[PDB]
Amino acid sequence: VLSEGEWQLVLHVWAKVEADVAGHGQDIHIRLFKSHPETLEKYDRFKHLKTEAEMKASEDLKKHGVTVLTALGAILKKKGHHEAELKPLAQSHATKHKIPIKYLEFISEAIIHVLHSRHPGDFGADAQGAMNKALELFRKDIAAKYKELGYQG
Numbered sequence: 322v323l324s325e326g327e328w329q330l331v332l333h334v335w336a337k338v339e340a341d342v343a344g345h346g347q348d349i350h351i352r353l354f355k356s357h358p359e360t361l362e363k364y365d366r367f368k369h370l371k372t373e374a375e376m377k378a379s380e381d382l383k384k385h386g387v388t389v390l391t392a393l394g395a396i397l398k399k400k401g402h403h404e405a406e407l408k409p410l411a412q413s414h415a416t417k418h419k420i421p422i423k424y425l426e427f428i429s430e431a432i433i434h435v436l437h438s439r440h441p442g443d444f445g446a447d448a449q450g451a452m453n454k455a456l457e458l459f460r461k462d463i464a465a466k467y468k469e470l471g472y473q474g
């Protein structure tokens with residue numbers, strides 16, 4: 322459970338993301354795919370991308386980043402009251418995409434790294450701590466949904 326203050330810090334930095342969602346999304350995917358190359362292997366639509374400049378140039382990957390962040394943004398703005406937003410996400414990611422919880426840990430790490438890189442003066446130790454907790458909550462709740470659907474990833 323996050324405090325009200327924690328949620329405010331989360332949402333304060335999120336508003337910075339929303340000034341350039343596409344650019345944040347690109348940087349997060351590029352970070353994820355560099356740090357954990359197996360995740361890219363998992364995306365049939367993107368696994369052909371061989372270099373960082375190809376990744377940055379892909380309109381399709383840029384659009385997907387906006388989709389990912391828009392969904393995460395809508396989740397965070399519910400401040401933990403996110404069942405209606407999380408369920409379909411769990412459904413797809415468990416049953417269609419087959420994404421294990423550990424890949425969600427990887428992209429959470431990517432998010433935190435990008436936000437710190439771009440917004441250090443609004444992403445100090447307390448804001449990082451709040452965002453860590455929000456993303457932990459997201460992963461905990463997605464994991465319970467995966468189990469409910471029969472997926473132990």
Ligand code: HEM
Pocket residue numbers: 360361363364365366388389390392393409410413414418420424425428
């Ligand atoms: C913050 C975490 C995440 C969010 C909010 C998110 C959100 C989304 C959304 C909204 C879509 C499109 C709708 C859908 O199919 O459900 C999508 C598709 C996808 N997700 Fe995620 N996702 C997340 C993490 C990941 C990670 C870590 C992977 C790593 C493999 C992944 C792989 C995919 C794939 C393969 C698709 C389908 C893309 C396509 O072929 O069009 N997701 N995700």
